[PDB]
Amino acid sequence: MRECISIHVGQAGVQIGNACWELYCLEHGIQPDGQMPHHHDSFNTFFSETGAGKHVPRAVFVDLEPTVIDEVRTGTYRQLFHPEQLITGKEDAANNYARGHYTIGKEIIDLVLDRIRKLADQCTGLQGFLVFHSFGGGTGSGFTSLLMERLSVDYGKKSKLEFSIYPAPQVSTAVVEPYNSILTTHTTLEHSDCAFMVDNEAIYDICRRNLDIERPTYTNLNRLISQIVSSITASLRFDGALNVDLTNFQTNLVPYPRIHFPLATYAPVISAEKAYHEQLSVAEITNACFEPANQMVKCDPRHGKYMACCLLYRGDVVPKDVNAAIATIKTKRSIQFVDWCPTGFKVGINYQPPTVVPGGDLAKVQRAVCMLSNTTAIAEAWARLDHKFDLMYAKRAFVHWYVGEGMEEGEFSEAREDMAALEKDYEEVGVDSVE
Amino acid sequence: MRECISIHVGQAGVQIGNACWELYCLEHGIQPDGQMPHHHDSFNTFFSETGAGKHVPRAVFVDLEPTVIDEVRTGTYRQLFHPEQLITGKEDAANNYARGHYTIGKEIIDLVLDRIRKLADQCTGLQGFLVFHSFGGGTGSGFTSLLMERLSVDYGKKSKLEFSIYPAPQVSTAVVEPYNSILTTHTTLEHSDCAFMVDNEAIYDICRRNLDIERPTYTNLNRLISQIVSSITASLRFDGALNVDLTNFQTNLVPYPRIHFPLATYAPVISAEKAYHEQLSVAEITNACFEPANQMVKCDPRHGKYMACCLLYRGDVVPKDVNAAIATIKTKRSIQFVDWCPTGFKVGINYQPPTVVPGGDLAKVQRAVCMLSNTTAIAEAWARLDHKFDLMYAKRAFVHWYVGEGMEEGEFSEAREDMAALEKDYEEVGVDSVE
Amino acid sequence: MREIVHIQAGQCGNQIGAKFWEVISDEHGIDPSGNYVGDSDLQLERISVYYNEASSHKYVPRAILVDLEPGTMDSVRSGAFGHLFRPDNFIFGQSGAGNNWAKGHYTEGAELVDSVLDVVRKECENCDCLQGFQLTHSLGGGTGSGMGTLLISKVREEYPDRIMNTFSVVPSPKVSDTVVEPYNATLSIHQLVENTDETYCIDNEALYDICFRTLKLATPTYGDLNHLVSATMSGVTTSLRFPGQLNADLRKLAVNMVPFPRLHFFMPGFAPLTARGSQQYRALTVPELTQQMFDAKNMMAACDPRHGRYLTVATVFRGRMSMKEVDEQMLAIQSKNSSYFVEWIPNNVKVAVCDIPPRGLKMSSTFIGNSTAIQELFKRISEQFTAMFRRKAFLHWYTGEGMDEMEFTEAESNMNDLVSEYQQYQDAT
Amino acid sequence: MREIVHIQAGQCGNQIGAKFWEVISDEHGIDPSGNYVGDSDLQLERISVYYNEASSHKYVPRAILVDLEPGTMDSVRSGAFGHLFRPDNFIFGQSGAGNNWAKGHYTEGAELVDSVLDVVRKECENCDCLQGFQLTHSLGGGTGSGMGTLLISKVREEYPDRIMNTFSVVPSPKVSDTVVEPYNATLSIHQLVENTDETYCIDNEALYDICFRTLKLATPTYGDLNHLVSATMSGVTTSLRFPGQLNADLRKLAVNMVPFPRLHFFMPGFAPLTARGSQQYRALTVPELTQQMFDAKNMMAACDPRHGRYLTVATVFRGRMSMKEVDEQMLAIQSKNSSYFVEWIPNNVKVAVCDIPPRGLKMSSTFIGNSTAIQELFKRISEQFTAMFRRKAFLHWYTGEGMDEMEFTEAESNMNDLVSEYQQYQDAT
Ligand SMILES: Nc1nc2c(ncn2[C@@H]2O[C@H](COP(=O)(O)OP(=O)(O)OP(=O)(O)O)[C@@H](O)[C@H]2O)c(=O)[nH]1
Ligand SMILES: Nc1nc2c(ncn2[C@@H]2O[C@H](COP(=O)(O)OP(=O)(O)OP(=O)(O)O)[C@@H](O)[C@H]2O)c(=O)[nH]1
Ligand SMILES: Nc1nc2c(ncn2[C@@H]2O[C@H](COP(=O)(O)OP(=O)(O)OP(=O)(O)O)[C@@H](O)[C@H]2O)c(=O)[nH]1
Ligand SMILES: Nc1nc2c(ncn2[C@@H]2O[C@H](COP(=O)(O)OP(=O)(O)OP(=O)(O)O)[C@@H](O)[C@H]2O)c(=O)[nH]1
Ligand SMILES: [Mg+2]
Ligand SMILES: [Mg+2]
Ligand SMILES: [Mg+2]
Ligand SMILES: [Mg+2]
């Protein structure tokens, strides 16, 4: 009845979406082929119903290179997806935002926009867009920019939520990573309501310590991020003692036109053998979620101040003990809020306990907490990325590639100055000021 | 009771008619041999019953060369057709309009007319004529123009509908199409109630893109044509909640005596494996039929105005959503009507779902939409074709074949200015005028 | 006694009448075979008004069904509930009029009209005292609009001292079923306002809004849309078919509702309209029935009464009810809504009570109000006809069957004169 | 007789209403199917104050449930006690206001209040003599707060000579459920101050403390919280729902407790509250009832009357008792606790007695006090709002849907003026 559509861009987007839609299929009790053996609406939010008993997702898979889309076609989820949406080009952007935004990006953007319009007109009470894309990827960044511009032009005032993949400080897999990051962030700073950040090194630390897995393939990381996505969406997808919506998320998290860069966290993340020797109480999971060693962005909030917080509890939950835990964490010393935000908390509750996938790394739980914090600890990450980009650009490396692929110098200069101003404003707002 | 006869001329008409009459027996449950395994009339308007249980069609197959008719006699549909009607000459016209209209047309025109009066007297409530003739060829252009003179005088005011094969702009089978087309249109402009336009290059895109077939032989292409043909007369042969007769479209789609050139369109056209993942609702097939990528003539309607429209639904259709879906089309701005046509739609419903021939490309479907819009977008088709012919006549290429076979040079000038007059009037009426 | 003859022209008439003669059988307890199998004797004391008794206690309807094309009869003749009609009545032509006025009034309809007048004169040479004729035609098509107008002028000559009521279906403002509506509509009204006594204007999406919103139906087919026009049709003629505390009849409505000869275009309306699930939660009583009548949501003509003033109002109640509630509330309606009533007709309300409830319901009522909100209905049609005729669109197919541009001069002028007097009476003082 | 209409807004409104109608059905002996199954006739002697009679002896609540988000309606319709409400009452929008005053008062407000006002006018038709309105809502959310404000303004416009009681769930002082409370709270408070009659401010953490300490519940839930609130509301309304030795009603309470137009913010309380185990070790009697009423620990609003003075006090008793003990002991209360009573209102006392006890208990009592301890709540809200607004945070989307800065300035000025008047009237001589 309130319809939200998901756009998955790049190889990271496609894999994360595969994991996320798998998790949705287990959550709503639907078989991979579309049949099925509080519950029934819920699936009408995502799974559009066809003439027969089959249900089909509202997903729009788009890529330039065809290999990953061929893989997802050949995967076990071959019947579920509607074959038309799997849009593939012929060659990738090869970590070139110029290629992914100007040269080839305009030859397929018309088709993806046509499919978006078809799906959005198909639904009734459209809510918004969820964009699953990376930052290092050239196609990811270019299509992110292009699709943000096109969707903002077409649909005026709707929710546009992004689940990015922040570049890691020490872990690195690209060389034009600072260029891609600066360009995409400058382009999509003004065209997104609220953009979450996820980093791979942080997830690797979490999986190494909290879950104690020595062989953490990308499947486990994708499973984790899918769990956060499902937790944030379960409020719309299910009924609870206190519901919360995407507009609620925006209006309670982001206070300013530019400062809309929160970070996600999930709890509890404990292993299988350690499940038996733990109690899993509301207060203890709340403390674990607020623990700085569980955050999924490699930035310790001890260097900064929390500015806004939203927590969704799901499962059997009592609002009294939720209140007690929130009050004691508010009165704790190490967590420090801003002076001009006397109330910095937003609580939501859901009656549906999370369900664990078969063969997954996590264990079955009766209570789950998802946390989304808008803080100032992201300023250090912005500063580090800006410093890396400036150091790389000081002697004009790869600029010949970028300029040859239809660029100029004003774009780089304006992106640099724009992120300098954004970091300055972020720090000035986050820091305490007299009066 | 109300009877219409079909005249199929040339290998275009015969090949279309081979699959055209393939569909009617399937619709009325007629075995190829005439035996049988809404109902009970159905077939009395097409299948003139004989003494035995056999039903024979009301078709007049005529051609100059004895080639294309030969496989009809030796095909699987051998017993169904009555052996007398298959009129054949001895040699073709060789894409020569002069040969098929002055030299060899006359020596056989008196034989087809004999079988017309034979069949017109056999029926009681004769309604009109169906013509299946192309434009590029000789026997399909010059010979059928002779018929339009012969049937008009014999029967003053009856229905005369033509299902032409418009020559394609880029695709070009023959080399003298600009000579055959302009000579045909000028003579048959004043002897046609309405002429549905079909282009050959347009059906490739429909089969390649919408249906996703890489090997579109003429067997599969002609299948997509008989569906509209069986759609125009789908209300005479079956009872519906809102019936339409052949004079309805003739009255609803002809604002002026000259502007009577509509263009067909069919929907839904979807593949077999894609059928399971489509909802196939009344609300979308109205939009699916109207999209500019689904028309069967290579002329995008966005360049012009919709002079009028006409829709014929069927199956489990409810007249409310038809009212609802049609109403919202006026709001959407890909449609653009003329000022003097505030009401510009016609709707017809039927209770018989369409039936798919076994082995065909289409899949079983419960609904069908067949739009016939007279629109200004066809004005570019005449002007573009008129440019090609005007280039030929500049240096009188290929003329010596025409002049020596029984036509004058002066006759060519009259056909040239006639298309200029039609183009001027059609654009002037289509464009707005003061007061 | 007080006989009536019912005519059906066009596709709608044969479709509306397909369900009209269904409810009448249920009211009078008549089996589809045609033999009475009822129990109460109050039905048969006046059964001859609509049904006609024949040999061996078999009753056949006093109605004639006609169309230029044969598709419509084959549905009703071969289908169920076609056993009770007398086969002589089923007049059908050769080909349909093809949504053309001229082909239905001059060229093709002229042949068949002689085959139907000789049935009408035969129709009740046995009818003891004719009350009048009921005509159920459409204003959009050719056969229903064209010949149905021709039939009226011919019937008017043979029976001048009689009344006829037309249950026409006036075209919709938002949607046009056929492209050339304004030509058929204006050409038909020009002859209607001359030789008819009273007209029930009805829209189609006005029934769509009522069925979707009030009745809560998602897929209203024509089987359900026409089923509500039948209820209004049975309500008007239930006064002289059943005993009542305060009786009325067709001649009583005409004199109470037509202050001037050129003003006889009405607006029907029915109440109550409750769903199959939301009816146990509402107690049926006289209060809400009158309230449900006067709101713009529940009216069968798509015209907002708020922009106009009622000239006269007639309500035909049914069921069993004390009269005090029936009239004590029409004062409150007159008092609360005093701004929506014309001033120079004090006491502009007509009421009537029957004594037989509609099947399956405890009580119900019908509203027929001659308002001035029809003013906006004729302006819109005359507006569309104004622009279309200026370019002579579709005109070259009317002049070819007898008519001419001279004919169109009167239709627009007479309409323009009529719609003006339909308004300056509202503004008169 | 003295009909009263119930309005519910927001998720809090729907949940509190579900529990409240649970209480009313249990009190009046109404089966979940909707048919009376009780034995006593005193309850049916006056059944029409809340319920409405319908055919087949059904009873339908006079409830108007409406919220922008449809989840609450889906839950209440699918769950039990959904078989007695009338579906037409259930109004729901497309999307929740998202804790935004702008979206709850300007964007969906127009259409939603149009529909709900039409339903209100329909509902008030059946009432014989309208007594007043009840509106249970929250000042924290967006839809409930803003739309209840708009609905209250329009209902006041339509019905000037009538009273409305608002049960507002004031945001808790110690904890905030959401982030942006103060803007919504200040705007709603100013609107209520301008256009309301009386307000029973109810807090959440105070009720948490009451349920944990006095009732000894380890894991209290919203079910128990709403149980207590519904008990308070039923105790308030039983005075005119039921007979008694000394009856009172809504207008009596309002005239006794609104000495000035801008001072109508109250503080409720209920007694007794005893656990299932510790109920057999105390004899239920008027002394412990009154003493438990008059101790801050048993106060349903998070304020301590020790810092203020009881401006006026109402005690609505239940069960069977004697006015002798009632009065002589509330007199003992007045004598012992004199220092916390205002001096310029001698006899600041109102007492009423009913006859029907609450279900499953010998006798109970409800306290309603107008004090000056709400001043601390108002000033704390003012401090939070002024800080968050001088930072100008979250402001430009309240601006982005209609508002701008001078509205916030004027709301703060009006609320501060009310605070100043409240204090200077507490400290008068
Ligand atoms: N979280 C997560 N991130 C991934 C995964 N796979 C790849 N990535 C990230 O994606 C980045 C690669 O960019 P892509 O968008 O995949 O680029 P591409 O798909 O090869 O297409 P081009 O950009 O044109 O080369 C790497 O830096 C990774 O950090 C994954 O499975 N999980
Ligand atoms: N749609 C369709 N068009 C066809 C088919 N076969 C031939 N044509 C068209 O027919 C044209 C050839 O002209 P024809 O009128 O058929 O020539 P003919 O019938 O052999 O007669 P002659 O000109 O005397 O040889 C080509 O340009 C094709 O576009 C067919 O199977 N389907
Ligand atoms: N209310 C209602 N109207 C109908 C129904 N069926 C058809 N109509 C109306 O009838 C009109 C069709 O005109 P008709 O006079 O019936 O046309 P026809 O009888 O098929 O014959 P032609 O006039 O020659 O086309 C349409 O505009 C519809 O609005 C129905 O079931 N219910
Ligand atoms: N006493 C009580 N208060 C409740 C209960 N449930 C929610 N609340 C309060 O209601 C507030 C939520 O505001 P609502 O108006 O209901 O918000 P909503 O219904 O989700 O819709 P929006 O206003 O648009 O956000 C919270 O601050 C809670 O304090 C309940 O069961 N009992
Ligand atoms: Mg790639
Ligand atoms: Mg040939
Ligand atoms: Mg017809
Ligand atoms: Mg809500």
Author numbering:
A (entry chain A), B (entry chain C): 1 to 37, 40 to 42, 47 to 441
C (entry chain D), D (entry chain B): 1 to 429
Tell me, in the authors' exact words, what the paper reports.
Microtubules are tubular filaments composed of αβ-tubulin heterodimers, which adopt a pseudo-helical geometry. Microtubules switch stochastically between periods of growth and shrinkage, a property called dynamic instability, which is critical for their function. The structure of the microtubule lattice in the GTP-cap region differs from the one of the GDP-microtubule, allowing members of the end binding (EB) protein family to selectively recognize the GTP cap, binding there with about ten times higher affinity than to the GDP-tubulin-containing microtubule shaft.
Moreover, we could demonstrate that polymerizing ‘mosaic microtubules’ consisting of a mixture of two mutants, αE254Q, and αE254N-tubulin at an optimized ratio, can eliminate mutation-specific biochemical effects, thus generating a faithful mimic of the GTP cap. At 20% αE254Q- and 80% αE254N-tubulin (referred to as 20%Q + N-tubulin), mosaic microtubules grew steadily with the speed of recombinant WT microtubules which grew at ~21 nm/s. To test whether the different tubulin mutants incorporate in the mosaic microtubules at the same 20:80 ratio as present in solution, we conducted mass spectrometry experiments and found that 20%Q + N-microtubules indeed consisted of 18.9 ± 4.3% of αE254Q-tubulin and the rest being αE254N-tubulin. First, using TIRF microscopy, we performed titration experiments of 20%Q + N-microtubules to measure how much mGFP-EB3 bound to 20%Q + N-microtubules. mGFP-EB3 revealed high affinity with a dissociation constant of 14.0 ± 2.6 nM, similar to that observed for pure αE254Q-microtubules. At an optimized 1:4 ratio of αE254Q and αE254N-tubulin, mosaic microtubules nucleated and grew as straight, 13-protofilament microtubules like WT microtubules, but were stable and bound EBs with high affinity due to the presence of GTP-tubulin throughout the microtubule lattice. Thus, we conclude that the 20%Q + N mosaic microtubule is a faithful GTP cap mimic, isolating the structural and biochemical consequences of the homogeneous presence of GTP in the E-site of tubulin dimers, eliminating any detectable other mutation-specific effects. Hence, this finding suggests that the net structural change induced by GTP hydrolysis in mammalian microtubules is mainly an axial compaction of tubulin. Hence, considering that 20%Q + N-microtubules are faithful mimics of the GTP-cap, our results indicate that the microtubule GTP cap exhibits an expanded lattice, which provides structural stability to the lattice while the protofilament twist does not change much after GTP hydrolysis.
